Amino acid sequence: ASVHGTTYELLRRQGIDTVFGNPGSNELPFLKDFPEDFRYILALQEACVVGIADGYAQASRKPAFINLHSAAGTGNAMGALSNAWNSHSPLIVTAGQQTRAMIGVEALLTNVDAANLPRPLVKWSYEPASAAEVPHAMSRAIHMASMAPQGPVYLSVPYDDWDKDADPQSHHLFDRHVSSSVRLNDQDLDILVKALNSASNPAIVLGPDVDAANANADCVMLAERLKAPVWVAPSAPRCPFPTRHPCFRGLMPAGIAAISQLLEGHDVVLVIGAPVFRYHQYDPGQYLKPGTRLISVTCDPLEAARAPMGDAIVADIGAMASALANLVEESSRQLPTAAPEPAKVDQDAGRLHPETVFDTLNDMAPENAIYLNESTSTTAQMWQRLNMRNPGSYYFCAAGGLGFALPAAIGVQLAEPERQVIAVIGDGSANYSISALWTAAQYNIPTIFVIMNNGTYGAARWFAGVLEAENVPGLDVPGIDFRALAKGYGVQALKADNLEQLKGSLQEALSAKGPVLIEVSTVSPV
Amino acid sequence: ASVHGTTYELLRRQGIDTVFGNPGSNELPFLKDFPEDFRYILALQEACVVGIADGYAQASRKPAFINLHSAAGTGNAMGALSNAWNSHSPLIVTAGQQTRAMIGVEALLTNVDAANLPRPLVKWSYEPASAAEVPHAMSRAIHMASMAPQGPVYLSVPYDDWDKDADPQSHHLFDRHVSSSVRLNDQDLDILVKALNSASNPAIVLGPDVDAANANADCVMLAERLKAPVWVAPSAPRCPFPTRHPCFRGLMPAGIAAISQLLEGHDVVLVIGAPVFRYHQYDPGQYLKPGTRLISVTCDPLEAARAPMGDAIVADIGAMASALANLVEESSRQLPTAAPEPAKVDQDAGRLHPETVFDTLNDMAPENAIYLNESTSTTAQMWQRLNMRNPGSYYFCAAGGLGFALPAAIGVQLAEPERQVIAVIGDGSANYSISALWTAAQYNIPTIFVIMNNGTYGAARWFAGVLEAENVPGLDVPGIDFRALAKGYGVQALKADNLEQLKGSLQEALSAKGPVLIEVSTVSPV
Amino acid sequence: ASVHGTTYELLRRQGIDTVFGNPGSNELPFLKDFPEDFRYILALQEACVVGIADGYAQASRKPAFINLHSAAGTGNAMGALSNAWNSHSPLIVTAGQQTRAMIGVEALLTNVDAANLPRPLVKWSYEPASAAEVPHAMSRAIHMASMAPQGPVYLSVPYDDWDKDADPQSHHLFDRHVSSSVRLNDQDLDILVKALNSASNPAIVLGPDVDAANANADCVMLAERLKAPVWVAPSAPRCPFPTRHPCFRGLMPAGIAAISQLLEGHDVVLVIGAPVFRYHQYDPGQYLKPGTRLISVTCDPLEAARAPMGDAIVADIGAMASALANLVEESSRQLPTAAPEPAKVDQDAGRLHPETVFDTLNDMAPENAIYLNESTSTTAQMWQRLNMRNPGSYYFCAAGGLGFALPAAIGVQLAEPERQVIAVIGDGSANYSISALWTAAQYNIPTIFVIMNNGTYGAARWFAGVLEAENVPGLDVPGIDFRALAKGYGVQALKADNLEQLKGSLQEALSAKGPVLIEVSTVSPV
Numbered sequence A, B, C: 001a002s003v004h005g006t007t008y009e010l011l012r013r014q015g016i017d018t019v020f021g022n023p024g025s026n027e028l029p030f031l032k033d034f035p036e037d038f039r040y041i042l043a044l045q046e047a048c049v050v051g052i053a054d055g056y057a058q059a060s061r062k063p064a065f066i067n068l069h070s071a072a073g074t075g076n077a078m079g080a081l082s083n084a085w086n087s088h089s090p091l092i093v094t095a096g097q098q099t100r101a102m103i104g105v106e107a108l109l110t111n112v113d114a115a116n117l118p119r120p121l122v123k124w125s126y127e128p129a130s131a132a133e134v135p136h137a138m139s140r141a142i143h144m145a146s147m148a149p150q151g152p153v154y155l156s157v158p159y160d161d162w163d164k165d166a167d168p169q170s171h172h173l174f175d176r177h178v179s180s181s182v183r184l185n186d187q188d189l190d191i192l193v194k195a196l197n198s199a200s201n202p203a204i205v206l207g208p209d210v211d212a213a214n215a216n217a218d219c220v221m222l223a224e225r226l227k228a229p230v231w232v233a234p235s236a237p238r239c240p241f242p243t244r245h246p247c248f249r250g251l252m253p254a255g256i257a258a259i260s261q262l263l264e265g266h267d268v269v270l271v272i273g274a275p276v277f278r279y280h281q282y283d284p285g286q287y288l289k290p291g292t293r294l295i296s297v298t299c300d301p302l303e304a305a306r307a308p309m310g311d312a313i314v315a316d317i318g319a320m321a322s323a324l325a326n327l328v329e330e331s332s333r334q335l336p337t338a339a340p341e342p343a344k345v346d347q348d349a350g351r352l353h354p355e356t357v358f359d360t361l362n363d364m365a366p367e368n369a370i371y372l373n374e375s376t377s378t379t380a381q382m383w384q385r386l387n388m389r390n391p392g393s394y395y396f397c398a399a400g401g402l403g404f405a406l407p408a409a410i411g412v413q414l415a416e417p418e419r420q421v422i423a424v425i426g427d428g429s430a431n432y433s434i435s436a437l438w439t440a441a442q443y444n445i446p447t448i449f450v451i452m453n454n455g456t457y458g459a460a461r462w463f464a465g466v467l468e469a470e471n472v473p474g475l476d477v478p479g480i481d482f483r484a485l486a487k488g489y490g491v492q493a494l495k496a497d498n499l500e501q502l503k504g505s506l507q508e509a510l511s512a513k514g515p516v517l518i519e520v521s522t523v524s525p526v
């Protein structure tokens, strides 16, 4: 059998049926005679390919396969790979390399020193020594991407490899099953459980890997058994907990001092599926105040190693959350009182306050809606004002790289056709991966895009204030007509200049069978 | 002084007065108190930032300075860096890093292992070990960018460095002159001149570094005294020769066998400022046919090392072209006859043959027009049909990475305000860096954007033919309205459904004071 | 032809006839049917293999070819490659790789991610994508190592490649000549010559690349015409000037303040073939005091870029030194007066002072002797007391990597059969590459090893004083019998406990036909 046939069989046999790509010559011998049980999703630029692929992988909780064109295509997608690195997204990124006969001469579209290009943003990067090796290399890619801690991997493949004979023994690869579904040994897990049982004022902190493990329900049960408040870890890329549960206390601010204060008076702090911690703003102080003991559970040794404080257990979040949920005694302490409802804000008949948008979305959106956030100055309000009961209801660019939410919303909507994806994106952020809209139109993926137009990079202006930066150029982005942009890529476009128009547009957007973009005129913070 | 003040003084004294960027928190302490004698050019995405800076750097023949945001911003720009790598574009790429105190905990927007990210696409890549080192590091960046072979470099700077005290001894950095304007020693140069004087049927092949060195006029002299036909080396990123000069023989096809067949009968082939060679399609055969001696003059050791044939001289192209032009005797042989005018392609009253568009541009565009090419299926015709008399008149993505021409056209126009820049871009290629249109609108940069809309990735279909690949998905890009895209970014948009509308639209765009986009309906190759 | 046959032809055709190696399974298909016109030099460990080739390459001023065993062998030589990096030694390091069929499974002696292993200490690092590419890859390594700035390169080759069919078009590789023999253009060179002619108190500073270029003779004539004093740049790996020429002022100390104090009063300082500067100890102050113009001529862009001060010309040192010596006017200033002869130190009938050893060596050694220094606390006294009239008379570990001198002494002696090599090596430093003694013995290479036994790491204790480091362990090395070690490896062993025995031992060493080690009891600094 050929490398072509063997590789598609391995993919198929390992559960892959969708290829996200932007093609070029070095990929044609891979893509030719594309099998009828595979689906190809074209995006017009490689940051969109990877973003779409990334949303699809996070929502489906399974590896996503990507096909890019050499160094240029791989390069265009590296910002997107930084997000995928931080979210532990199992992406199998493959890139076509020149024919082996011309790699030496460095013909046009040779990916020189290819394995080094995506580093340090990939778990594994490789160009096979021979055509026969390609299926084995792909096998490695697949398992490396899928093993905890999940993440992007990179395989460069010379285009002449596909027509060559596969390694005869390649069939051993098809049904290889690898498991990293592990948990702390019995003796040490009992010690942890006793520690949690003996705590007088436990707090829980939950990171994105809880939602990637679909460990949300076990964390609810753990929280209810320990009668403990629950915060989402800072810079949250996913929502690991129902936002209106009695225990839920919201998003931790991304600051050292803010978090030690929040955790003060809690004797044990159990962190699950999060870095300790993903701070953003510099807010020096104590990592922890006296009296506080931190225990981290993470699937990534890199996170465990770099924690400035606390103990760590490196294990599968799914397996550990389940184990802990079912092992901890029910505490006779009083269950936390639900956080109060956010106060409605004053809203005139003109431009919309972000708080008004999220209240309207919350009232009109279905209870199984999935929200994507790239409205970077409105994030704290969005967390207060959206009720998200279900797992897989929230995504935010995990490495802070803009151009994620728009394409990612298209991948999430593809992965979850029965759940309405609502992407809330700033006018700044929308431009990074704008051409992703075209995939929504061509493949008729019914994502709703709500562009929050305040005419500026609002969050940049906020940081300018916190860093006392005066006379900073390039913080405003006037003169962008997002309805024309939507129209350019064949997406239905609505305006929402006020609350009356917003409600009308959401009603029309929610019923639509294709993608809809709503341009909301929001109040600038200037 | 502060590291901030010392660094801007270094830039200023090194002739840098313009920052191309897309800002973020990590860049604010660098961009704050932006000096009044500096200019800041915002682009909405980093591939556009770098593309505009690259076009600018190539047209000005001076380094361009770039400021990006962490791993995300740098990542977004890497496809653009691979083009800059192949074009020897002197790009100084700076990226903001997290405060040194939070680099270890890997807070959000820590560029982890930063220096490795842009590798292998930069000459030099560095993160200073202290704030006081930053001006020295920047000095190194500037000189590494600017020394032959020119190319992109990378500096990651923790944002807390900028406010720190500068070393008073950093003042030595300000007026450093580094020269790489070198040529072959007298003895060996005379030997080369005698070989060229003794040649009975010499050929000259010119690459992009001739144009980058502005050695075009010297190569014209060299060609006229040797009475030698001149080709442009394959996959040409620039035009190093007047295309209607009697000696000019056209763009070499990007294939091994094709080139050796072309150079057959020429006893000495002098290659200047090009790789040997930038083949593209695999067209195996002889590198050189018997009887052809090849001598390459290159400013890049890496090119000289990887030539599969010939002698090489590593030296500055300008110093060497000038030396050779002046040292060679005038041959008594007859001057080559000018290539015949290309035949007029039959055109009906409907969709436009590409050949018709280039004929119209040639008849209507000014004689000092600058063209950029990202209409990938029409390159050979463009080269046959555009008369480019002057230096700096043609640009094409040097590593074949699409998303170059649109932003680069804006950079070129910025650097050359008195030369009309016309970017001929395919409908597929337009989408990679579409948001660069915004920068042309905001800064009123009067580039003409000619979108050749054939409904498809035509050059991919051509390679599918040559690779005998059938049932390849993702080769069609229907349903894109470019006039609506232009409108969304504030650029004036015209259509051209036929020859008369093309003429009218070009007349209107040529006289326009702002940027204009023309969507041309072109005949599809399918 | 085979890859094997074609590769040996290329090597042969490019002037290589000697292979320095330590063999293993992965290299046997390369080493088999070893040509009759090639020589193989075995060393017992890879630091010694590379040390010997380095000495050979430096003495011969030609590339040396090395063959090491996969990752462990390559890894063993990486300390030695750091020296080779710093001395710009043209080393072609090949390492055998596992058969391509077993790379993926990572069989024992798979060099995983091979090209990254020797980085960042190599100019070029590569594993070919196919067997047929190996000759081309070898061509690249050969030229990359040989081109200015010369340096070590690395090629990893799967062992199954050698028996495979080579491409017939690889014959074009055989006689490729690449020149980097370049100098500054006429116009800018005239400006420099005019500046040198106009200097009232010029100084010259010379570094190792002068010796490497064999530009010593031209620098003597340059110094004599400019009537200028001449220093060797600090931490000198080589000797670029006769040490008793009237202009010679000695080895600059490796500190910032000490060098600006030395250069004070010189209006123009011409630095040729050196970094600016290779400091060592931290001696903060001014890089250059006001009133001095520093002009650096360097073959290395990396050196040009990182100089804290001065202008730079990146050119070939031989071409430049020759150019300048012929272009400068003869100054009417008086020739500098020779520095005084050093004072005879007090010496009793017991342990030898280093000064006595070098005085005795100067008296007794032949005038064409070659000295290698790895006696680290006595370098200053060595430069004062040895008259080195000739080029190629001194070598010292260029990156400060101990274990260079002993093996490099053997390579130099092999390269220079008619010049007596005398390696002066401390008792600590002798141990790093002690096994190299065997190679001297086995190939009957008559190096003299003078071992300076002071029973301690002297220069470490010195630095311990300048750093005020008390209670530091591991500074003493008692209980090593170097005659026993010499006997162990079959090298004739003498001793010198006093001046009488030293004079007798050296007389014997100089007259001996094979290698000789002399263990000298020297006064300890403790």
Ligand SMILES: Cc1ncc(C[n+]2csc(CCOP(=O)(O)OP(=O)(O)O)c2C)c(N)n1
Binding pocket: A079, A374, A375, A376, A377, A378, A400, A401, A402, A403, A425, A426, A427, A428, A429, A430, A432, A454, A456, A457, A458, A459, A460, B022, B023, B024, B025, B069, B072, B073, B076
């Ligand atoms: C690729 C990339 N470029 C730049 C940034 C820095 N950045 C953070 S927030 C921000 C502003 C985005 O503005 P907008 O989308 O309009 O949201 P708003 O702040 O106005 O709410 C920018 C440019 C980033 N994080 N990633």
Ligand SMILES: Cc1ncc(C[n+]2csc(CCOP(=O)(O)OP(=O)(O)O)c2C)c(N)n1
Binding pocket: A022, A023, A024, A025, A046, A069, A072, A073, A076, B079, B374, B375, B376, B377, B378, B400, B401, B402, B403, B425, B426, B427, B428, B429, B430, B432, B454, B456, B457, B458, B459, B460
């Ligand atoms: C970043 C990147 N992605 C993909 C490619 C592959 N590619 C080469 S040509 C081409 C066709 C572009 O089509 P278009 O711009 O419409 O011009 P046309 O081929 O129709 O003449 C594509 C997709 C590339 N070169 N670079």
Ligand SMILES: Cc1ncc(C[n+]2csc(CCOP(=O)(O)OP(=O)(O)O)c2C)c(N)n1
Binding pocket: C079, C374, C375, C376, C377, C378, C400, C401, C402, C403, C425, C426, C427, C428, C429, C430, C432, C452, C454, C456, C457, C458, C459, C460
């Ligand atoms: C591979 C390596 N290990 C350690 C050192 C540090 N080092 C520099 S000098 C020195 C002392 C060597 O002592 P010796 O050779 O006996 O000479 P002495 O200082 O006594 O003259 C040491 C350990 C080094 N430069 N390289």
Ligand SMILES: [Mg+2]
Binding pocket: A426, A427, A428, A452, A453, A454, A455, A456, A457, A458
């Ligand atoms: Mg905004």
Ligand SMILES: [Mg+2]
Binding pocket: A116, A117, A118, A119, A120, B116, B117, B118, B119, B120
């Ligand atoms: Mg990288």
Ligand SMILES: [Mg+2]
Binding pocket: B426, B427, B428, B452, B453, B454, B455, B456, B457, B458
């Ligand atoms: Mg097209």
Ligand SMILES: [Mg+2]
Binding pocket: C426, C427, C428, C452, C453, C454, C455, C456, C457, C458
């Ligand atoms: Mg010692």
